[PDB]
């Protein structure tokens, strides 16, 4: 089961992912991305590891507007937790890989792109992932059109009801 959550910036995709993680408990393995307050973005894993990987203070060749992205800081936390999530999820179908966000800042990492492609196209694992509403990178387009996936456009009008639909589709 692949749940792909999309929607406008600020609509609450991370917030929803966090609710999903709490409900899933030990089933959920991966990471989400929280705003630093806005001056940047922090990766937070399901093990509570945290690091600012994109910031208005960071000098970088990898830029999204005024945010400098440190690919190495992102990878330090993202890659090992996703490699673990993928190993565990292949053996235990109760596990759900968590990836917030497959977005422009994260996609500067080749290691992340390759691992995301491997995970998303593997029929044998469950995933909850977010993508931006615009096709800001070819991998975002690829994931938006992923065959068999559940694609949810998160809005202010379904924000407070959509959780149970998602949780039912995943095993109770
Ligand atoms: Mg978010
Ligand atoms: Na959003
Ligand atoms: Na949010």
Author numbering: 1 to 37, 44 to 178
Reported in the publication:
aaTHEP1, the gene product of aq_1292 from Aquifex aeolicus, shows sequence homology to proteins from most thermophiles, hyperthermophiles, and higher organisms such as man, mouse, and fly. In contrast, there are almost no homologous proteins in mesophilic unicellular microorganisms. aaTHEP1 is a thermophilic enzyme exhibiting both ATPase and GTPase activity in vitro. Although annotated as a nucleotide kinase, such an activity could not be confirmed for aaTHEP1 experimentally and the in vivo function of aaTHEP1 is still unknown. The crystal structure of aaTHEP1 uncovered a modified RecA-like fold.
Analysis of its nucleotide loading state using HPLC revealed that it was partially loaded with ADP (approx. 30%, data not shown). It was crystallized using PEG3350 as precipitant in the presence of KH2PO4 and crystals diffracted up to 1.4 Å using synchrotron radiation. 172 amino acid residues, 249 water molecules, one phosphate, one magnesium and two sodium ions were included in the model. No electron density was found for residues D38-K43 which are part of a disordered loop. aaTHEP1 consists of a single compact domain confirming the gel filtration experiments as well as the resistance of aaTHEP1 to limited proteolysis. All nine strands form a single sheet in topological order 918723465 wherein a five-stranded parallel and a four-stranded antiparallel region can be distinguished. In contrast, as it is the case for both aaTHEP1 and the RecA superfamily, the ASCE-proteins contain an additional strand between and a catalytic essential glutamate (E107 in aaTHEP1) within the Walker B motif, thus indicating that aaTHEP1 neither belongs to the group of GTPases nor to the kinase family. No electron density for an ADP molecule was found indicating that only the nucleotide-free protein crystallized. However, we found electron density for a phosphate ion in the putative nucleotide binding site where the β-phosphate of the nucleotide is expected. In the nucleotide free aaTHEP1, there is also a magnesium ion at the corresponding position which is octahedrally coordinated to the hydroxyl group of T14 of the P-loop, a phosphate oxygen and four water molecules. To detect putative binding sites of aaTHEP1, we colour coded the surface of aaTHEP1 with respect to the conservation of exposed amino acids. As can be seen in Figure 5, there is only one highly conserved region located in and around a cleft of the protein surface which includes the Walker A motif (P-loop).
